């Protein structure tokens, strides 16, 4: 307790394994303190290579543990600190410890590899190349996950989620295929932290091209994801919703699996959720559903979600309102005349017009496109004048006229076109 770095060095440089153990535990305690652990001072003392060599002392398990914990905490820091651990040779030494007969040492190695992989795609891929996946997955090859210690299982799930994480590049396809069956099993486990990190892992794996989405959807997980979308724990709902959102960015068939699994029945709650980030990500998800086929738009209608989109457009955080505007422009670009009429009957025009007062150029462009699409539907019914009156009555004509004189060229063009054609 409270040793100086100088004393730690003195003990670690002794030729006495027990003196080395005591000094390594003292380093672990220094690195474990709540405020400002002296990571850089330990690195600068040259201690990483010694710690790494201690990981290999099978005949002294306590010093394996203390050095694993010390190196975990060094690797928990900046990229430069994690690099110092990797440059010491720690990756293969930790992978060898995954097979330790001492569960607390195996777990510490799991943790350290999670920090290293969590640094970014290069270290992730280097952990994979040194062969970490097979022994990690072997630790979870039990008939019932509930026999494992809870903290150990949580750490295993977390580390596997970091092997799934990051882009440019995404993880190797073969590694993802190797991990996915275990992730599917963890997604059905009943611990909330395991469920959260399993959802995070799936949200990473579905953040990319449609072929990556397909790898996940083919495993049949969309129904469990929709169940978790309904959980009461916000740490579960957040990544489950991110994963669902990612999936509906894919093909119409991938989106339909989300719809078939019952997801839309959760959106009344998600679109009114008191957490701003949930409302925003739910509305983004809705906008990618309304960019789908007419029969998918129809499912949005049937689930009663158009009033909820009108609500979010009327009042929500601005970022959420922007996603809602997108959802409406997609809806009106893809929908039938009857669907677009319905949108107007639900009260979309006034909140849409109110958002033309925003200082964000992109949302104005989006709203003008939506108004154009609605006017096109009205043209097919011969009701353009009725719509013009509605837009004038709520103050929308004033806002569009003003937008004729707007810095962005596309805004001015769109406004003038609307006025000349309909007003």
């Amino acid at each position: 307790v409270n040793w100086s770095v100088e004393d730690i060095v003195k003990g670690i440089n002794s030729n006495n394994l027990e003196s080395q153990l005591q000094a390594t535990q003292a380093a672990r305690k220094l690195l474990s303190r709540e405020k400002q652990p002296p990571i850089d001072n330990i690195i600068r003392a040259g201690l990483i290579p010694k710690f790494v060599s201690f990981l290999g002392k099978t005949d002294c398990s306590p010093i394996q543990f203390e050095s694993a914990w010390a190196l975990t905490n060094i690797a928990s820091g900046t990229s430069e600190q994690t690099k110092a651990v990797v440059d010491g040779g720690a990756i293969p030494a930790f992978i060898s410890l995954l097979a330790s007969p001492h569960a607390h040492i195996s777990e510490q190695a799991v943790w350290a590899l999670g920090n290293i992989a969590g640094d970014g795609s290069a270290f992730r891929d280097l952990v994979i190349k040194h062969g970490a996946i097979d022994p990690l997955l072997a630790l979870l090859a039990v008939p019932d996950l509930s026999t494992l210690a809870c903290g150990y299982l949580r750490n295993l799930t977390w580390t596997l989620s970091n092997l799934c994480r990051n882009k440019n590049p995404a993880p190797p396809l073969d590694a993802v295929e190797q991990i996915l069956p275990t992730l599917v099993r963890l997604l059905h486990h009943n611990d909330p932290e395991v469920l959260a990190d399993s959802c995070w892992a799936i949200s990473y794996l579905t953040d990319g091209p449609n072929e990556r989405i397909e790898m996940v959807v083919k495993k049949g997980v969309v129904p469990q994801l929709v169940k978790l979308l309904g959980a009461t724990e916000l740490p579960i709902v957040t990544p489950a919703l991110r994963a669902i959102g990612n999936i509906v960015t894919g093909t119409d068939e991938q989106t339909q699996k989300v719809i078939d699994a019952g997801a839309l029945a959760v959106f009344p709650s998600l679109l009114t959720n008191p957490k701003t980030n949930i409302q925003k990500e739910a509305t983004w998800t809705m906008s990618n559903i309304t960019a789908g086929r007419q029969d998918q738009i129809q499912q949005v209608v049937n689930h009663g979600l158009v009033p909820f989109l009108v609500g979010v457009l009327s009042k929500a955080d601005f970022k959420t309102q922007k996603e809602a505007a997108w959802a409406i422009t997609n809806y009106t670009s893809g929908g039938t005349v009857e669907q677009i009429v319905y949108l107007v009957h639900c009260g979309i025009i006034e909140p849409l017009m109110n958002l033309l007062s925003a200082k964000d150029t992109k949302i104005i462009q989006v709203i003008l496109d939506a108004i154009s699409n609605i006017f096109q539907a009205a043209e097919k019914l011969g009701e353009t004048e009725k719509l013009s009156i509605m837009i004038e009555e709520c103050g929308g004509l004033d806002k569009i006229e003003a937008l004729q004189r707007h810095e962005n060229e596309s805004v001015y063009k769109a406004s003038l076109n609307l006025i000349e054609k309909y007003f």
Partner: peptide, 4 residues
Amino acid sequence: GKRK
């Protein structure tokens, strides 16, 4: 269209 979709937005990733």
